[PDB]
Design a protein around this motif. Sequence first.
Motif, short mmCIF file in Angstrom:
data_model
loop_
_atom_site.label_atom_id
_atom_site.label_comp_id
_atom_site.label_asym_id
_atom_site.label_seq_id
_atom_site.Cartn_x
_atom_site.Cartn_y
_atom_site.Cartn_z
N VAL C 31 0.85 -1.16 0.10
CA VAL C 31 0.21 0.00 -0.16
C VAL C 31 0.93 1.04 0.21
N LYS C 32 1.88 1.25 0.90
CA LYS C 32 2.67 2.43 0.82
C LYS C 32 3.39 2.73 -0.40
N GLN C 33 3.97 1.63 -1.09
CA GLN C 33 4.59 1.78 -2.05
C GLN C 33 4.31 2.25 -3.48
N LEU C 34 2.79 2.62 -3.34
CA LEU C 34 2.12 3.44 -4.37
C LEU C 34 2.25 4.82 -4.33
N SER C 35 3.03 5.44 -3.00
CA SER C 35 3.18 6.85 -2.82
C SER C 35 4.57 7.47 -3.68
N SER C 36 5.20 6.69 -4.12
CA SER C 36 6.46 6.67 -4.95
C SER C 36 5.86 7.53 -6.24
N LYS C 37 6.48 8.52 -6.69
CA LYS C 37 6.51 9.23 -7.97
C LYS C 37 6.75 8.39 -9.12
N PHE C 38 7.83 7.67 -8.86
CA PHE C 38 8.52 6.97 -10.28
C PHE C 38 9.14 7.87 -11.31
N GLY C 39 9.42 8.88 -10.65
CA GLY C 39 9.75 9.90 -11.82
C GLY C 39 8.70 10.64 -12.43
N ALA C 40 7.42 10.49 -11.99
CA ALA C 40 6.48 11.45 -12.81
C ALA C 40 6.41 12.68 -12.09
N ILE C 41 5.26 13.51 -12.39
CA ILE C 41 5.00 14.89 -11.93
C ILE C 41 4.26 14.84 -10.47
N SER C 42 3.39 13.74 -10.21
CA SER C 42 2.71 13.41 -9.15
C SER C 42 2.13 12.23 -8.73
N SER C 43 1.93 11.71 -7.60
CA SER C 43 1.70 10.49 -7.15
C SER C 43 0.14 10.32 -7.65
N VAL C 44 -0.66 11.15 -7.24
CA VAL C 44 -2.21 10.96 -7.70
C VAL C 44 -2.13 11.24 -9.13
N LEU C 45 -3.33 10.75 -9.66
CA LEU C 45 -3.39 10.24 -11.18
C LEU C 45 -4.32 11.34 -11.96
N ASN C 46 -5.41 11.53 -11.10
CA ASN C 46 -6.29 12.50 -11.73
C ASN C 46 -5.84 14.11 -12.25
N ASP C 47 -4.91 14.36 -11.30
CA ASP C 47 -4.58 15.74 -11.47
C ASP C 47 -3.51 15.64 -12.85
N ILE C 48 -2.92 14.73 -13.02
CA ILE C 48 -1.86 14.52 -14.30
C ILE C 48 -2.93 14.84 -15.55
N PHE C 49 -3.87 14.06 -15.48
CA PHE C 49 -4.85 14.23 -16.75
C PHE C 49 -5.56 15.69 -16.87
N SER C 50 -5.64 16.17 -15.66
CA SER C 50 -6.35 17.57 -15.68
C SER C 50 -5.35 18.75 -15.50
N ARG C 51 -4.04 18.40 -16.10
CA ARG C 51 -3.16 19.45 -16.27
C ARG C 51 -2.28 19.43 -17.36
N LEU C 52 -2.18 18.37 -18.19
CA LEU C 52 -1.18 18.29 -19.32
C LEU C 52 -2.22 17.71 -20.50
N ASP C 53 -1.81 17.98 -21.65
CA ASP C 53 -2.24 17.56 -22.91
C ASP C 53 -2.13 16.15 -23.04
N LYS C 54 -2.97 15.65 -23.85
CA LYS C 54 -3.21 14.12 -24.09
C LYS C 54 -2.08 13.74 -24.92
N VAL C 55 -1.38 14.87 -25.52
CA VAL C 55 0.01 14.40 -26.46
C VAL C 55 0.96 13.81 -25.89
N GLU C 56 1.37 14.42 -24.57
CA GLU C 56 2.62 14.06 -23.78
C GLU C 56 2.10 13.83 -22.47
N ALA C 57 0.88 13.65 -22.03
CA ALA C 57 0.34 13.19 -20.82
C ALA C 57 0.62 11.59 -20.59
N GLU C 58 0.75 10.97 -21.84
CA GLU C 58 0.91 9.50 -21.93
C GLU C 58 2.42 8.96 -21.69
#
Lengths: 49, 322, 195, 183
Positions: C31-58
């Motif tokens: 459970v704790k291990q999903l707090s890691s960003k893995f080099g992404a911009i944020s741990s939570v996932l809905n904010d990623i989709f609501s902040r960057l375009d679909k071209v480079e959000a993938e």
Amino acid sequence: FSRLDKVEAEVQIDRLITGRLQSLQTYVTQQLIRAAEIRASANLAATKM
Amino acid sequence: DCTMYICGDSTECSNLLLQYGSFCTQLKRALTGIAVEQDKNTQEVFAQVKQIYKTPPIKYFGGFNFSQILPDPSKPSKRSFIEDLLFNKVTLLICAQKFKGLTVLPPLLTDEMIAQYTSALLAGTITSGWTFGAGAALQIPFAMQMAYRFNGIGVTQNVLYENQKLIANQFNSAIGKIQDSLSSTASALGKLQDVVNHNAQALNTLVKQLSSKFGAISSVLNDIFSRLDKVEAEVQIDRLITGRLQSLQTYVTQQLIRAAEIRASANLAATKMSECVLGQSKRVDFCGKGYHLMSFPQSAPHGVVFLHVTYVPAQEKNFTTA
Amino acid sequence: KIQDSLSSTASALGKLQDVVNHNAQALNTLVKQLSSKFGAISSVLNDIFSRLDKVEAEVQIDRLITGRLQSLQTYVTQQLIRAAEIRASANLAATKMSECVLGQSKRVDFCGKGYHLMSFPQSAPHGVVFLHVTYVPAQEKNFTTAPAICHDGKAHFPREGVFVSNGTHWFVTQRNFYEPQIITTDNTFVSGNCD
Amino acid sequence: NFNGLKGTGVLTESNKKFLPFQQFGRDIADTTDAVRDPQTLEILDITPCSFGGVSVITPGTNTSNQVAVLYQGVNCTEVPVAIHADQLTPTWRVYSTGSNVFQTRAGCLIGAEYVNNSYECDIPIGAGICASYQTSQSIIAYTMSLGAENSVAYSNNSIAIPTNFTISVTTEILPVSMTKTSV
Ligand SMILES: *[C@@H]1O[C@H](CO)[C@@H](O[C@@H]2O[C@H](CO)[C@@H](O[C@@H]3O[C@H](CO)[C@@H](O)[C@H](O)[C@@H]3O)[C@H](O)[C@H]2NC(C)=O)[C@H](O)[C@H]1NC(C)=O
Ligand SMILES: *[C@@H]1O[C@H](CO)[C@@H](O[C@@H]2O[C@H](CO)[C@@H](O)[C@H](O)[C@H]2NC(C)=O)[C@H](O)[C@H]1NC(C)=O
Ligand SMILES: *[C@@H]1O[C@H](CO)[C@@H](O[C@@H]2O[C@H](CO)[C@@H](O)[C@H](O)[C@H]2NC(C)=O)[C@H](O)[C@H]1NC(C)=O
Ligand SMILES: *[C@@H]1O[C@H](CO)[C@@H](O[C@@H]2O[C@H](CO)[C@@H](O)[C@H](O)[C@H]2NC(C)=O)[C@H](O)[C@H]1NC(C)=O
Ligand SMILES: *[C@@H]1O[C@H](CO)[C@@H](O)[C@H](O)[C@H]1NC(C)=O
Ligand SMILES: *[C@@H]1O[C@H](CO)[C@@H](O)[C@H](O)[C@H]1NC(C)=O
Ligand SMILES: *[C@@H]1O[C@H](CO)[C@@H](O)[C@H](O)[C@H]1NC(C)=O
Ligand SMILES: *[C@@H]1O[C@H](CO)[C@@H](O)[C@H](O)[C@H]1NC(C)=O
């Protein structure tokens, strides 16, 4: 390659090479687990023999 | 270590590894779980007794020559001669190049105590016989003891009476000749150095694995920082650190398999010192390739060598029955 | 006396508590291990989709959906290992339930730390406890031996038993109790000469 | 920074005999560990700082807060030299010279005093060392002992027949199954 140029296809193709490499490492690992089970049962037969 | 293998001699990497966090913390727990069992094995293989015995200065063992296995006081250590050759045959700059945190921790027990434990058993099995693994040991002379071990096959005690002299001297020759067979070749000990060869080449593969670029521009962390933008540097270095951490999980997941098979040999060797040297065993082709008499343990680098004194019948004759 | 030893400490039942500890602590890290960003911009996932375009959000969600996809296979792999010695202890348990309890075991130090008498299972959480009823010898006494005798000019050796004497007569005893008896023809046979 | 070969670490004096044209010295890990000064033909060896981790040997925090650290295989006549933070860190750098420093085969245990007689042991330390919390309570490190050497009067006429017994009832604890899980 025939559609997208070489300048950026490296990272594009890198996303696909890592897909297969992760699958081999899974297949061989399941063999090492399995091969111990037969080795366990290759000694419960060498004893009844 | 978490950082001595990835973010060694650097600071911009140690900060980056902290966000990852719980990965390598699990790594340290795996290799610490293995280490503890490496002492639960040796504590069980030899130390199944509560009294370290020692044979008296008198060394007349039932008329059977035993000097080879019993340690000689004249030697600097109380180590038997066979162990000298045994430690000589096994082979081990191998650590000074491991500045990458791969610090081979020494075992808790030392080689003398392991020899001290080992010499206790031969002190036990000869003086005390087959009843010293069950609490209070009972002194047993070695000559008339055969009338009981043979008795557990189907032969009356009269074998050691009506044929004592020829039987007694025959056991003498076989024991001595074995030393020559130990000096024959290296094929006999193939089941010990294979362990130290398997568990040392793996380290070498791990160390040289650091040289891999893992898709990064440069294989050294300090150079990649000095020739590209800081905002885009995050993804580049993060590519490499995941590669090493993935490569570190491969090494540990091989030792879990390796530790799970030595555990078998740590649980069967705990029987031949509990069912076989402590009593004439009856699992056929398990102690003696043939009807069994006893055993005589020894020691070795990361392993054990046994000398199972079996019993194989000689030439035969035919008759008519009813 | 057993109940006192059961309540003596907390390590008496340490070999079952480890199983529940090592198979509930594994979840907590997962459970704790999903707090890691893995080099992404944020741990939570809905904010990623609501902040960057679909071209480079993938690009970034790829780095996150592969980190968790491998953070989860590791849990499976450590679970195949942990089910290999329990399968290797439910075979030893199904053996001490197969010879200790279904009869008596001739092995030395298998169904008892010493000579063995019986056994008992007591069902326990995620395990079992064997009340290995065992025999253990107590205090002893000294004697002198002579594995032979010759009385009528010829050998005569006993059916089963040793020749031990305290100073008056050579007596016959078994191997774990002092239990003497005088010489008698019933337990004695002639076998060869006495020289 | 020697001719663009960047890095980090302390520098030492090396006796390696570089060839007239060779300048770098690598190892198995393809890591530079010997460079020649561009300024003069003197050979330098690059080594890291003191390393190996520290394995503190403490009783439970329920009991007192006394410790006894361990350095993994370091001749610790050099740990005081490697320590310049004695003022910065309280009750840490002071351990360079704490209790009577003892030296084992696995580095020097600091903060405890060797004792002579041999008992059973509690905390496995390494290379033949165990400790326990005893005497006025402190940290005492010694060598293990299975027990007193019991001398048996081995003889060609001696035997031992027990005349009594006991029926022990020990508890062997075996796992049989883990918790079923689903993801
Ligand atoms: C060794 O153990 C024996 C076992 O009791 C001790 O008793 C001695 O040996 C026998 C016992 O079977 C006795 O012989 C018979 O005794 C009865 C009863 O006294 C008597 O009515 C018979 O006529 C016959 O003599 C023997 O007397 C008895 N005592 C002695 C002094 O020999 C024996 O004492 C033990 N020896 C030791 C501890 O040195
Ligand atoms: C069993 O045989 C060995 C063979 O070496 C004997 O060892 C020799 O013992 C004699 C004295 O008995 C010494 O003079 C020799 O030097 C020993 N040999 C060596 C190589 O040192 C051993 O003594 C015999 N067993 C008994 C009980 O005598
Ligand atoms: C009685 O038990 C002792 C246990 O040591 C045997 O050994 C004798 O011990 C006494 C000391 O109490 C010595 O004085 C003797 O010299 C020892 N015997 C020998 C042969 O050295 C003793 O042999 C036992 N006696 C009997 C009759 O069993
Ligand atoms: C074995 O030792 C026990 C322990 O002393 C003996 O039990 C004693 O037996 C006697 C009479 O049989 C009683 O008067 C004592 O009170 C018992 N002791 C205890 C602690 O209850 C037992 O008799 C011994 N067995 C043999 C065969 O000698
Ligand atoms: C803490 O240590 C004391 C000894 O001073 C002991 O009596 C107590 O039981 C310990 N605490 C626990 C929870 O065991
Ligand atoms: C450890 O250092 C001491 C003091 O400098 C020295 O006498 C000893 O030989 C050294 N041991 C080594 C380097 O193994
Ligand atoms: C401890 O043992 C050493 C030798 O092992 C000896 O020189 C010293 O006097 C002993 N000290 C005490 C207090 O027993
Ligand atoms: C036991 O050995 C000693 C010396 O070797 C000898 O004098 C004695 O006769 C032996 N006893 C027996 C019963 O063989």
